[PDB]
Amino acid sequence: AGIKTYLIERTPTIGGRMSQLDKTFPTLDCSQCILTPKMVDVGRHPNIEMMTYTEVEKVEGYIGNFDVTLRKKARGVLTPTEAT
Amino acid sequence: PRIGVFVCHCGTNIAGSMSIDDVVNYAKTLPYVAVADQYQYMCSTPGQKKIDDAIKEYNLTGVVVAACSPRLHEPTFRTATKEGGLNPFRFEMANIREQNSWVHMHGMWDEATQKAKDQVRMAVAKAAKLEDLVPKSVPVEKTAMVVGGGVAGMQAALDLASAGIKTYLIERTPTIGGRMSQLDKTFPTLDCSQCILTPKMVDVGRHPNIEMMTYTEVEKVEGYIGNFDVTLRKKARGVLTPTEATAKGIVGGGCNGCGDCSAVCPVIKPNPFEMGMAPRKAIYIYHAQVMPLIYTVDFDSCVKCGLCVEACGDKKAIDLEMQDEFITVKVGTAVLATGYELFPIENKREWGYKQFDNVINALEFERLICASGPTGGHLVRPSDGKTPMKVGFVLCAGSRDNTGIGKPYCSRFCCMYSLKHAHQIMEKIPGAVAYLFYMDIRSFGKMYEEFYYRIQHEGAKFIRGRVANVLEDKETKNLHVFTEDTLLGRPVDVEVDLLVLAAAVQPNEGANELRKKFGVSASQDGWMLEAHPKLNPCGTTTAGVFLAGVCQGPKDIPDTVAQAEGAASAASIPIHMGEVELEPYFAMCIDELCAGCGMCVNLCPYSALSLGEKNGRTVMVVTEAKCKGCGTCGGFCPGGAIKMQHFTTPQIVAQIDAFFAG
Amino acid sequence: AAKGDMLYAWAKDAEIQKKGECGGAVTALLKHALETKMVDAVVAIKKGKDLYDAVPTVITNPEDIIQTAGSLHCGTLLIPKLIKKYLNGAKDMKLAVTCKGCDAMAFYELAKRNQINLDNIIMIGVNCGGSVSPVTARKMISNKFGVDPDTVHKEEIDKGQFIIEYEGGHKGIKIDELEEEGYGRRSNCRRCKMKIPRQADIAAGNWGVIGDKAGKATFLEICSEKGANLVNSAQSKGALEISPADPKGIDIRAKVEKAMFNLGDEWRHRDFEGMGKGKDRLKLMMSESSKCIKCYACVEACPICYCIECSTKKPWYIAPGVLPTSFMFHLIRFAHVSDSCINCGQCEELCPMEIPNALFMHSQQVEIEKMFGHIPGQDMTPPIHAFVEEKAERARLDATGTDSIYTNIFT
Amino acid sequence: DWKPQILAIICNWCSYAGADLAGGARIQYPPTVRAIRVMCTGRVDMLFILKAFVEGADGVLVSGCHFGDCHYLEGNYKAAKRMFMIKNLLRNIGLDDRRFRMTFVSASEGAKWGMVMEDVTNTIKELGPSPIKEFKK
Amino acid sequence: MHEYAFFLGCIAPNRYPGCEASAIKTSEKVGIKLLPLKGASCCPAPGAFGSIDLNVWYAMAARNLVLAEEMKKDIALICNGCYKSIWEVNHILKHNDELRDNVNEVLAEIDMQFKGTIDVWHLAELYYDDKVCGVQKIKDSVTTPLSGAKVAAHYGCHLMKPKKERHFGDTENPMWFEELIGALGAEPIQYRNKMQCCGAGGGVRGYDIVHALDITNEKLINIQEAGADAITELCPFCQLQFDRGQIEIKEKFGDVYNIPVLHYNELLGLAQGMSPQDLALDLHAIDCTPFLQKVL
Amino acid sequence: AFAVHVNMERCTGCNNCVVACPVNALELNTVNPSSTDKIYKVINGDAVILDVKHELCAGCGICVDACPYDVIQLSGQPP
Ligand SMILES: Cc1cc2nc3c(=O)[nH]c(=O)nc-3n(C[C@H](O)[C@H](O)[C@H](O)COP(=O)(O)OP(=O)(O)OC[C@H]3O[C@@H](n4cnc5c(N)ncnc54)[C@H](O)[C@@H]3O)c2cc1C
Ligand SMILES: Cc1cc2nc3c(=O)[nH]c(=O)nc-3n(C[C@H](O)[C@H](O)[C@H](O)COP(=O)(O)OP(=O)(O)OC[C@H]3O[C@@H](n4cnc5c(N)ncnc54)[C@H](O)[C@@H]3O)c2cc1C
Ligand SMILES: Cc1cc2nc3c(=O)[nH]c(=O)nc-3n(C[C@H](O)[C@H](O)[C@H](O)COP(=O)(O)OP(=O)(O)OC[C@H]3O[C@@H](n4cnc5c(N)ncnc54)[C@H](O)[C@@H]3O)c2cc1C
Ligand code: SF4
Ligand code: SF4
Ligand code: SF4
Ligand code: SF4
Ligand code: SF4
Ligand code: SF4
Ligand code: SF4
Ligand code: SF4
Ligand code: SF4
Ligand code: SF4
Ligand code: SF4
Ligand code: SF4
Ligand code: FES
């Protein structure tokens, strides 16, 4: 829709439980396989700021402006962008 | 041309069926192949990096990936090919997993390897002849259409309008609201069903961005994701709104909903809103809470006595000679929300629905129990007007039935609404007992199990047995329900004063006609089909059309509203952007090969082909926006004057030739 | 006089009526149309040399149609494809064209494919009982008739025998006897069954003219309103005489037409079973077609071949330089033409390598016809693949009683 | 010494989906058929089939959507008419017309796709090598 | 005059011969010709013989079918149990190939083959069909009104059920047999649970007579409560149950009904003027004399 | 345009349904006969109604009132 978005995930990867599922009822599609495209879309979208392994420490504000403080947990490894 | 062949292992899903090393060496020795290489997961970031590095190093013209299905990973590898300095459409896949490995796993290995070599050869042959395409971008009209004015249609319309898109709300009936307007109280919260809808009906009626068009149908639809030229039939309502009256010149106004017309009309007919239990004149409203309070005239039953116009007087809202007006509207996207009707349960003769007076179905029970219904909210027996004291509820009536008469699916909400009706009778008639003849109570939603617990606590009897047949006592008109109590282990004969059938639901009347107008397919169950059953339950395969509500499958009001807002979001995605890219599979006429015979023109379902003047010669003209890439015309044309952009005859014939190469 | 009338017609002009094969009504009608300016030209056949040479001619001077009078039985040519190639498909000028049954069928095939303007063309159709190749007629006359062919004045197929008029007298031999000995009408003419061109605007013949007018009247059948107008105008301006036909003449016309149908069926049979069945027919077809030198005469002469570039010329189908050409060359013509082949024989008779193109194509056509029920060349019905219908497709799948297209399709 | 050469031309929206579903469900069948994947079966020109048979296809299979279920409203009616005519041509050129068939496989019929594969393989094995390969010489 | 082979099973010829006599006479009066079946036997009775061995059930029913096959005629029946055996084995062996094969190699020991060329009809079904004698033709043939008689119909179970295997329509409340009784002039009455089994099917009549009689007594109670003066039926099994079982109920229990039980062919004969002696109404356990006083 | 049904089983061939029908009596007994079609004709001893498609009857009851041993039923309701 065009809105810049932050995606906060506490774990080092996106996907959730459906990434753990093997096959999916009632269509018996490979659960991981169907998910793989949408994960790639999220990872490549320019309007999504994917922040994995991060939590929400505190939130203040209202409908207008939410001042959300995030904790970027020490991943220990640098992405290419951060390394550069 | 210089082609790179990259063979995925899919993490032993392919290497456990063929010899990837042998496939790779064969690809190396193939003609036109610059580099052949392999990786464990070509769909992963190192795999795309491998493709890009190979492109840069070897100056690759095209890329062939021997991997899973194109339907699974064309976008991924097309984007990987773009990132690397190529066109996305210089890429071709060889499906060697879902059509080689998973089907030739056992005891046949060199045969699967030979099949893989053949598929790689055919893919390389096509890719050596692919050339550059650029997807077509088409503008999107900034309006939207919502067909259906039920809760799902109203929610979708309000969502689009509040997002700012101008919206058309088409409803075949004179009022919006749908089935939820007929409901009396709502499970599991027991809120007044009509009351919750009323603010939202007022919002829809007042919203400046919503063009509410009640009592109107969709005659025809042509166009595509960009512009849908939708023709609407404005049925002759017979009565003028104040706006239309002022436009026609009557200053005094149109219809203010006073009711004098229906006070004087002498014709009396059944009310379809009240499922036929209640009278209504020829000029009428369904109920007093209809959103456009405009008093339709029923022209199939009006006798043109002219008393209504005399009653209306100076308002002059009634035009007895009105005819069906037709309007053509251009819209960008469309949302389908046609809802449902009750399956005809008179076909199940063992439950005497039409033949015994005191057997009704669940929407008739809901109208009988509502305080605004034909009764004063008092449930009485149809046979004699006396108050029942024992009421039976036949659950699964026509459902989970494989005999060919009923429906083979569960209708989702019939266990819950039967619990609601049992509660309503036990609380409205003191001392009345509810018997539910059930076969799998299905209270799965939020607070549903607690609702079930509360109903059992208030004292409904739950007999686990599907009703076998129903006999009517000749004198008291009481109904003898025969089944077995499967848990007790004995047959039963429960004599009730009123029997309620929880009938199955089916797609509304005319829904198949409308979904064929819009190009939507149907499910196995008969409901409208979605794009992907798991990850895309709103969109359809035809672009620009979205589903909302029970029309896609039975659901409760919460699930229906979630689906409706999801569909509104999906329909807003292309409108907010304003651009949308079409897939460059179009037909392109080669004019100095066209002979102007005009025979291909009738082979296009979408009328994309026509005969036109170019350089004096009459040749064929493709409306590239209307073309969909099927290929019928280009497979017909004897002279080869039609070129299919990514599936050209030279490409397909090169694939055939490569298959027979040895 | 009105769209269905059967008439006797002869020319008022005595010289036109002498030079006509019958009463000169085709040459009086063509002359009248030209000189009253219904049409801007006239495409007829004239002798260029000895009567064995038939030369098509566009005539604009009304003074030159007396030269077109008479029927040449050695005129085995086909007119409508010449009108598309060198007269711009009659898109701007009205024409009046004299045509046989195959020439009327070709007109309708090309008009289906939008290559000529039948609103502009007027078709005066002649009955045809068959045509002979000129050189084969010469050999016939030299050997079987025992005559020097240059001696012959006129020659005609009348009552199923080959009458020739030379200096000394006249002779006659049964065409069936000649056709057994290896002469006679062309093969496709033996198989032909389009004897009275009722799809044309007028049908003229010597069948059904009995009694005092047996050689000085033409049997006219008015087959359209355009032909009715032409005939009424000619009769009123006094270029043509009209008397209502004799009912006995109509009856025996029907009987001769029916007998010609039966003879055509017999020859269709004996030829199509002469080609073989099973893998023997594939060896016949493949060994014959291996002779093709790719002159493309069959493509350029076929009425149904209207494509700017033939697919037989596209390098992904046929290798450009390989001369012992593939069977694909003839498979591409079987696929594109066999659904509507009018059995004109031009492909067979213009082949330098003597390949039975018309026999192969008609053998396929007859049963594409009894499969789909489409008769080529009769009217504006679109070709079978240019008009596919939902209900008909359902019908043929249900008639097979099967879930696919595999078997229970043929008997 | 001889292995049948069968070529399939399957539409993208029902027959490719059905073959993919069979693979996903792990339905085994012999590895004798190789597919081409066009968008609709309306794309299939007659010259494709004839080119296959003259290059030496022992069999040809064309698989598409059921009648009334074409993704492009009516593109398989055109294909059905074309293949009926192709059946007639092969019978009259003297090649065995059961070397060619057209099956209608929906997107959910992976089992039926497997059965089609097995039956096509069996029929071509009974029929034997095509005669064109020796008639050419 | 349509011609049918007349199967004539065990109970009608050997216990209630008036039923078969009236069948032939009344069918001839209307446009139907009932031809004797040459050496037909017990249709292997579906309960008492199908319960023992389905393969020999198939073989004997097929032998009965191939007799009429050699006769080149369509079977006509007057028994619901015989209809079950004959018609259903015909239908099963017209479609099941391995069962055809098995029955054929059993029958080949007696020089006899089943090919499935004929059709099986119930006589009441023929009387109801419009191509063959219809309700109007029955009304025409009726010469004694039989007015002022309340008559209860028992359909039976093997004619109409299961409806997924037959073609007679609704099994919950059919009215077709009520139209045939209304054609005769007698008013058919409706009673509680009119579609209940009489209790004699499946060999229960022999295995547990008290159980079968209780099932029958439930029906007799409902019929008396309605007020019937006779019970029409289309099955000699059901007639035997309703006739003998009234006597056995009178002795084993203490219940007296004295309700005459008549086959529809016997009522049709009475309507068309046949005599009670010519119908052999003296061979029934329950006296028909009150009903005869009412309708005569 | 009603429908008449003749009980062939008790028809004696008396022909008083043919003589008395006023549509049959149109041909020979009218000045300038309008229509010359006939409902009944007694073929093989019983009255056959040629008016198969129920176009000429007018529910007069002259034929029902004529047959001596009532055998003609007149249906006044749409067939
Ligand atoms: C055994 C099993 C089998 C199933 N099989 C099927 C099946 O076949 N088909 C089917 O349709 N459904 C199936 N389901 C249900 C399905 O898993 C759910 O419908 C679905 O996963 C819901 O996804 P969700 O995004 O809401 O939650 P989740 O998938 O659980 O995702 C929540 C995500 O949020 C993250 N998160 C949580 N708390 C925080 C926080 N404070 N800050 C940041 N991130 C946070 C989590 O790490 C996780 O990544 C199955 C469920 C189970 C248990
Ligand atoms: C007896 C009963 C009791 C129920 N009780 C409850 C309850 O207590 N709680 C609950 O949550 N759910 C309940 N449900 C379910 C609930 O009714 C549905 O979830 C809900 O109504 C779905 O709404 P919808 O908008 O999708 O369809 P609908 O409400 O049916 O609305 C569809 C609308 O589209 C219109 N329409 C149809 N076809 C066309 C067309 N071609 N062109 C234009 N307009 C068209 C219709 O006229 C209608 O106005 C009950 C259902 C029944 C049958
Ligand atoms: C090859 C051939 C075979 C025929 N066979 C029969 C037959 O079996 N039975 C029958 O009744 N009639 C047959 N006819 C037609 C017969 O000649 C007519 O009776 C005659 O055309 C009547 O016209 P006419 O004498 O009145 O006018 P004519 O003055 O004869 O006019 C004849 C017209 O035909 C044109 N013409 C001549 N040769 C050809 C040709 N090869 N192709 C096309 N047009 C040509 C001339 O240019 C002229 O315009 C045949 C005609 C041809 C050309
Ligand atoms: S591209 Fe396909 S085959 Fe390769 S790893 Fe990914 S899913 Fe597996
Ligand atoms: S009388 Fe006129 S203004 Fe009042 S409700 Fe009727 S139509 Fe509307
Ligand atoms: S015209 Fe007469 S019948 Fe019609 S709505 Fe008005 S009052 Fe009623
Ligand atoms: S929701 Fe309940 S009552 Fe309705 S079909 Fe399903 S199980 Fe039966
Ligand atoms: S593209 Fe082909 S079919 Fe279409 S008009 Fe041109 S020549 Fe005819
Ligand atoms: S490919 Fe041809 S027939 Fe198909 S939609 Fe495009 S133009 Fe029309
Ligand atoms: S093909 Fe037929 S119409 Fe043409 S010349 Fe031969 S016989 Fe006459
Ligand atoms: S005319 Fe004969 S030689 Fe010439 S291309 Fe045709 S078949 Fe070949
Ligand atoms: S293929 Fe030959 S015989 Fe057939 S229409 Fe063309 S030129 Fe005439
Ligand atoms: S063979 Fe086919 S492609 Fe070639 S000219 Fe004839 S119709 Fe056109
Ligand atoms: S009712 Fe009158 S018109 Fe009809 S058949 Fe009898 S006599 Fe004739
Ligand atoms: S009047 Fe009666 S008895 Fe006489 S012929 Fe007519 S129907 Fe028969
Ligand atoms: S989409 Fe498969 S046949 Fe058309």
Instruction: Say whether B98 and D27 touch across the interface (CB within 8 A).
Output: no
Q: Which of C183, C98, C92, C168 is nearest to C132 (CA)?
A: C183
Strand order of the sheet with strand B461-464? B359-361, B498-503, B390-397, B433-438, B461-464
Q: How many angstroms separate the CA atoms of C132 and B230, rounded?
A: 63
CB-based burial, E76-99: b 16+ in 10 Å, e otherwise: bbbbbbbbbbbbbbbebbeeeeeb
Q: Could you tell which of F12, F41, F51 is best to mutate to test the pocket of ligand 15, judged by most ligand atoms within 8 Å of the CB?
A: F12
Q: Is B589 annotated as a binding residue?
A: no
Q: What is the DSSP letter of B101?
A: I
> Angle CA(D43)–CA(B115)–CA(D104) in degrees, nearest 5?
35
Tell whether the torsion through CA atoms of B495, B498, B502 and B508 is positive or negative: positive
Which backbone phi and psi does C2 adopt, to 5 degrees? -155, 95
Cα–Cα separations (whole angstroms), residue F6 to B126, B207, B381: 80, 72, 48
Q: Which of D51, D48, D80 is nearest to D67 (CA)?
A: D80
Q: Is A49 annotated as a binding residue?
A: no
- Range list of H helices, B288-391: 307-312, 362-369
Tokens of E54: 């389905």
Tokens of C386: 């240019």
Q: How many angstroms separate the CA atoms of A63 and E207, rounded?
A: 82
Q: How many angstroms separate the CA atoms of B11 and B42, rounded?
A: 10
D67 vs C: CB within 8 A: yes
Q: What is the DSSP string of C326-388?
A: -THHHHHHHHHHGGG-----HHHHT-TT---HHHHHHHHHHHHHHHH---TTSSSPPPTTTS-
Which residue's alpha carbon is nearest to atom 2 within ligand 8?
B637
Residues 6+ apart with CB under 8 A from A72: A51, A53, A54
For residues B358 and B479, the answer to whether their CB atoms sit within 8 Å is yes
Instruction: Say whether C371 and D84 touch across the interface (CB within 8 A).
Output: yes
> Angle CA(E212)–CA(E217)–CA(E219) in degrees, nearest 5?
105
Q: Which of E156, E66, E57 is nearest to E120 (CA)?
A: E66
Distance B597 CA to ligand 8 centre (A): 5
Range of the domain at B603: 587-660
Residue appearing with tokens 């979408």: B606
> B606 in ligand 9 pocket by Cβ < 6 Å?
yes
Q: Is B27 helix (H, G, I), strand (E, B) or coil?
A: helix
Q: How many angstroms separate the CA atoms of B472 and B490, rounded?
A: 22
Q: How many angstroms separate the CA atoms of B624 and B312, rounded?
A: 54
Tokens of F20: 């008395």
C244 strand-pairing partners: C7
Q: Are strands B228-234 and B191-192 parallel, antiparallel or unpaired?
A: unpaired
B528 strand-pairing partners: B522
Strand order of the sheet with strand B166-171? B210-214, B166-171, B143-147, B333-336, B545-547
Interface of C with B in 308-337 (CB under 8 A): 308-311, 314, 316-317, 336
Q: What is the DSSP string of C262-331?
A: HHHHHHHHHHHHHT-STHHHHHHHHHHHTT-----HHHHH-TT---SS-GGG-TTTS-SS-SS--THHHH
Q: How many angstroms separate the CA atoms of C358 and C365, rounded?
A: 10
Instruction: Measure in Å the smallest separation between the Cα of D74 and chain C Cα atoms.
Output: 8
Residues 6+ apart with CB under 8 A from C193: C260, C261, C264, C265
Q: Is F76 helix (H, G, I), strand (E, B) or coil?
A: coil
Which residue's alpha carbon is nearest to atom 1 within ligand 4?
B43
Q: If you count DSSP H runs as helices and E runs as strands, how many of each does chain E have, helices first?
A: 14, 8
Other residues' Cβ atoms within 10 Å of the Cβ of residue C53: 13
- With 0-12 / 13-18 / 19 or more C-beta atoms within 10 angstroms meaning exposed / middle / buried, residue A80 is exposed
For residues C328 and C289, the answer to whether their CB atoms sit within 8 Å is no
Cα radius of gyration (chain C): 22
- Range list of H helices, C59-131: 80-86, 101-112
Which backbone phi and psi does B10 adopt, to 5 degrees? 55, 30
A30 vs B: CB within 8 A: no
Q: Which of A47, A21, A46 is nearest to A34 (CA)?
A: A21
Q: Do chains F and E touch (3 or more CB pairs under 8 A)?
A: yes
Q: Which of E176, E157, E289 is nearest to E230 (CA)?
A: E289
Mutate to test the interface with B, among C81, C116, C307, C388 (most CBs of B within 10 A): C307
Tokens of B399: 């459902």
Strand order of the sheet with strand E230-233? E187-189, E150-154, E230-233, E261-263
Helical pair D75-92 and C357-372, crossing angle rounded to 10 deg: 130
Q: What is the DSSP string of B37-82?
A: EEES-TTSHHHHHHHHHHHHHHT-SEEEEEES-HHHHHHHHHHHHH
Q: Which of C19, C20, C201, C17 is nearest to C103 (CA)?
A: C201
- What residue in B sits closest to C336 (Cα-Cα)? B638
For residues B176 and B134, the answer to whether their CB atoms sit within 8 Å is no
For residues D33 and D6, the answer to whether their CB atoms sit within 8 Å is yes
**Sequence letter at residue A59:** V
User: Which chains would you list as touching D if contact means 3+ CB atom pairs under 8 Å?
Assistant: A, B, C
Residue appearing with tokens 């005129």: C75
Q: Which of E122, E177, E126, E119 is nearest to E152 (CA)?
A: E177
Contacts of B576 in chain A (CB under 8 A): 1-2
- What residue in C sits closest to D119 (Cα-Cα)? C406
Tokens of B209: 């961005």
Residue appearing with tokens 């003449």: C249
Q: Are strands B359-361 and D59-64 parallel, antiparallel or unpaired?
A: unpaired
Element (DSSP H or E) covering residue B654: helix B649-660
- What residue in B sits closest to E226 (Cα-Cα)? B474
Residues 6+ apart with CB under 8 A from D101: C404, C405, C406, D61, D62, D120
Q: In terms of residues, how long is chain A?
A: 84
Please tell me the number of Cα atoms within 13 Å of B305 on its side-chain side: 16
Instruction: Say whether D72 and B644 touch across the interface (CB within 8 A).
Output: no
Element (DSSP H or E) covering residue D91: helix D75-92
Tokens of B450: 């607690």
Instruction: Say whether B603 and C113 touch across the interface (CB within 8 A).
Output: no
Tell whether the torsion through CA atoms of C79, C82, C87 and C92 is positive or negative: positive
Q: If DSSP states are collapsed to H, E and C, what string results for D31-89?
A: CCEEECCECCHHHCCHHHHHHHHHHCCCEEEEEECCCCCCCCCCHHHHHHHHHHHHHHH
A28 vs D: CB within 8 A: yes
Q: Is B493 helix (H, G, I), strand (E, B) or coil?
A: strand
F8 vs E: CB within 8 A: yes
Q: If DSSP states are collapsed to H, E and C, what string results for chain A?
A: CCCCEEEEECCCCCCHHHHCCCEECCCCEEHHHHHHHHHHHHHHCCCEEEEECEEEEEEEECCCCEEEEEEECCCCCCCHHHHC
For residues B4 and B93, the answer to whether their CB atoms sit within 8 Å is no
> B307 in ligand 6 pocket by Cβ < 6 Å?
yes
Q: How many angstroms separate the CA atoms of C49 and C70, rounded?
A: 14
Residue appearing with tokens 């084969």: C136
Residues 6+ apart with CB under 8 A from B448: B187, B188, B416
Resolution in A: 3.5
Interface of C with D in 237-256 (CB under 8 A): none
Contact pairs from chain A to chain B, CB under 8 Å = 25
Q: How many angstroms separate the CA atoms of E85 and E98, rounded?
A: 19
Q: How many angstroms separate the CA atoms of B231 and B391, rounded?
A: 48
Tell whether the torsion through CA atoms of B617, B623, B624 and B629 is positive or negative: negative
Q: How many angstroms separate the CA atoms of B312 and B240, rounded?
A: 11
Q: Are strands B143-147 and B166-171 parallel, antiparallel or unpaired?
A: parallel
Contacts of E130 in chain F (CB under 8 A): none
> B609 in ligand 4 pocket by Cβ < 6 Å?
no
Helical pair A31-44 and B70-82, crossing angle rounded to 10 deg: 20
Cα–Cα separations (whole angstroms), residue E211 to E198, E236, E246, F24: 11, 20, 14, 67
Mutate to test the interface with B, among A31, A36, A41 (most CBs of B within 10 A): A36
Question: Which residue among B118, B119, B631 sits closest to D42, beta carbon to beta carbon?
Answer: B631
Contacts of C383 in chain B (CB under 8 A): 599
Q: How many angstroms separate the CA atoms of B535 and B185, rounded?
A: 33
C11 strand-pairing partners: C240
Instruction: Measure in Å the smallest separation between the Cα of B226 and chain C Cα atoms.
Output: 28
Q: How many angstroms separate the CA atoms of C31 and C42, rounded?
A: 9
Which backbone phi and psi does C405 adopt, to 5 degrees? -110, 85
Distance B338 CA to ligand 2 centre (A): 8
Cα–Cα separations (whole angstroms), residue B480 to B356, B391, B397, B460, E272: 11, 11, 16, 18, 41
B327 strand-pairing partners: B232
Atom of ligand 13 nearest to the CA of C312: 4
Q: What share of chain F is helix, strand, coil (3-state, %, to 5)?
A: 15, 20, 65
For residues B380 and B422, the answer to whether their CB atoms sit within 8 Å is no
Q: Are strands F40-43 and F46-49 parallel, antiparallel or unpaired?
A: antiparallel
Other residues' Cβ atoms within 10 Å of the Cβ of residue E236: 25
Q: How many angstroms separate the CA atoms of E258 and E247, rounded?
A: 9
Question: Which residue among E172, E190, E192 sits closest to B349, beta carbon to beta carbon?
Answer: E172
Torsion angle of C-alpha atoms C242, C247, C253, C255, degrees rounded to 10: 180
Question: Which residue among D47, D80, D94 sits closest to C317, beta carbon to beta carbon?
Answer: D47
Torsion angle of C-alpha atoms F10, F15, F17, F19, degrees rounded to 10: 180
Tokens of B69: 């299905």
Find the residues whose C-beta lies inside 6 A of ligand 1: A 8-11, 16-18, 21, 24-25, 55
Domain ranges of chain F: 1-79
Q: How many angstroms separate the CA atoms of C126 and C22, rounded?
A: 11
Q: Is C307 annotated as a binding residue?
A: yes
Instruction: Say whether D89 and C334 touch across the interface (CB within 8 A).
Output: yes
Distance C308 CA to ligand 13 centre (A): 9
Q: In terms of residues, how long is chain E?
A: 296
Helical pair B557-577 and B151-163, crossing angle rounded to 10 deg: 30
Question: Which residue among B111, B605, B655 sits closest to D73, beta carbon to beta carbon?
Answer: B605
Q: How many angstroms separate the CA atoms of A77 and D72, rounded?
A: 50
Question: Which residue among C310, C314, C383 sits closest to B599, beta carbon to beta carbon?
Answer: C383
Please tell me the number of Cα atoms within 13 Å of E91 on its side-chain side: 12
Reply yes or no: is the peptide bond before residue B650 cis, omega within 30 of 0: no
Q: What is the DSSP letter of F10?
A: G
Instruction: Say whether C387 and B602 touch across the interface (CB within 8 A).
Output: yes
Ligand at shortest distance from the CA of F75: 14
Helical pair B414-428 and B362-369, crossing angle rounded to 10 deg: 30
Q: What is the DSSP string of E96-151?
A: -HHHHHHHHHHHGGGS--------EEEHHHHHH-SSSS-HHHHHHH--S---S-EE
User: Which chains would you list as touching A if contact means 3+ CB atom pairs under 8 Å?
Assistant: B, D
Question: CA E226 from chain center: how many Å?
Answer: 23
Residue appearing with tokens 């087959």: C223
Instruction: Say whether C388 and D78 touch across the interface (CB within 8 A).
Output: yes
B214 strand-pairing partners: B171
For residues B162 and B593, the answer to whether their CB atoms sit within 8 Å is no
Contacts of D24 in chain A (CB under 8 A): 28-30
Enter the CATH code of domain E2-123.
Answer: 1.20.1050.140
For residues B649 and C316, the answer to whether their CB atoms sit within 8 Å is yes
